[PDB]
Design a protein around this ligand. Structure first.
Ligand SMILES: O=c1cc(O)n([C@@H]2O[C@H](COP(=O)(O)O)[C@@H](O)[C@H]2O)c(=O)[nH]1
Ligand SMILES: O=c1cc(O)n([C@@H]2O[C@H](COP(=O)(O)O)[C@@H](O)[C@H]2O)c(=O)[nH]1
Lengths: 218, 218
């Protein structure tokens, strides 16, 4: 599995290149893994991945929540890996063929798929929560090795870890701004994803250092 | 929304030259283009303004938005900043996530389309069982624009039943995936067509043919 420094992944959702670069640079000593999503990519272009690689010693996880038909998912993964992403996050709710499409491109291209089985926000309760156990098991059957699950529902994060087993890699958003606790989350997740707590802080570096101090024993 | 010839071009070519040439080749037949991540992640969001400059077409950004409310808001804002007239949003992540999109669309004078059900085989696993509830959620939220599958006309008909004749319904899965233009237009206001046109030896003839086959529905 990827070796995530300090078990901490920056969710860089600032939408301005200068600010994104400043904040990421400021926390570079604490984090070697950066999640880049559509807020930043749709604002600055896919070349932002190349710039982060150039500027920082950071792995890039493209948080694109890929959720189309198999043919389109393939194209999305190809474009994303071509741009230099190490990994891509894919939704499971569109079903097995759509996930396999992504797995096949990632295998061909030497990169990784993360499967999002369940989400951290209130709305996830309406439809996603009821499908989550089956989406996770589908992931296991398809040979998915990397997963995303919510820090805001520890009971459910724990179940997800059970389903995927200890060998699978699990990262978890919803820490800080959404109410998730770093320590409690790391009982089950390999790494926490943190965005606003860090990138909106007056001192992002102090914010990251503080999160890390709070989980030192882990 | 008044779509010329009830025909929306799914421009999923991933080269700017080809995308512009092929769209130019069929310009006389369409005034509405669906641009998705395959083109955008390959050529950048500036391509949307380029299409408006070259063709004057309306642009539907097919981004399958499927994140938490806070991120969805950012995605919609970036998308409408780029000149999209409309954006397509998944309903599966729940009501708060859709409302986030509705908020930005209202603020910038744009439209949200709710994807209630998909056209590919994997849609059967999780999406189909939630589809009617997602459609009702759309109605509850005041959504007026919907997307449903050509490949399952009985399910497309049910979606039309739920949302009423006043709602606007567009439908992909025509041609390449097996859907029939005329049958689809029994229920959808417009059909979405990608490969059958853009991979055609002669895209203009392809579009002309499709239109010929539905000429009594125009
Ligand atoms: O269930 C999920 C899945 C996510 O990817 N995310 C993403 O993780 C990040 C959370 O950022 P924040 O720490 O500011 O709440 C955002 O990029 C969001 O899009 C999430 O919040 N919940
Ligand atoms: O259920 C759906 C929803 C879609 O947006 N689409 C999209 O509609 C288009 C279908 O293109 P095609 O005619 O080449 O099958 C693609 O852009 C695809 O991503 C779909 O095929 N099925």
């Amino acid at each position: 599995v990827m070796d995530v420094m300090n078990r901490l992944i920056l969710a860089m959702d600032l939408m301005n290149r200068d600010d994104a670069l400043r904040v990421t640079g400021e926390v570079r000593e604490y984090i070697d893994t950066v999640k880049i999503g559509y807020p930043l990519v749709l604002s600055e272009g896919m070349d932002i991945i190349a710039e982060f690689r150039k500027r920082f010693g950071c792995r890039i996880i493209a948080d694109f929540k890929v959720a189309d038909i198999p043919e389109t998912n393939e194209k999305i993964c190809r474009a994303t890996f071509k741009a230099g992403a190490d990994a891509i996050i894919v939704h499971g709710f569109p079903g097995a063929d759509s996930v396999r499409a992504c797995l096949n491109v990632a295998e061909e291209m030497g990169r990784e798929v993360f499967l999002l089985t369940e989400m951290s926000h209130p709305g996830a309760e309406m439809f996603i929560q009821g499908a989550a156990d089956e989406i996770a098991r589908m992931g296991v059957d398809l040979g998915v090795k990397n997963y995303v699950g919510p820090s805001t529902a520890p009971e459910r994060l724990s179940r997800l870890r059970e389903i995927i087993g200890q060998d699978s890699f699990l990262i978890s958003p919803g820490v800080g701004a959404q109410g998730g606790d770093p320590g409690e989350t790391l009982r089950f997740a390999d790494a926490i994803i943190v965005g606003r707590s860090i990138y909106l802080a007056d001192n992002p570096a102090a914010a990251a250092a503080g999160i890390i101090e709070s989980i030192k024993d882990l």
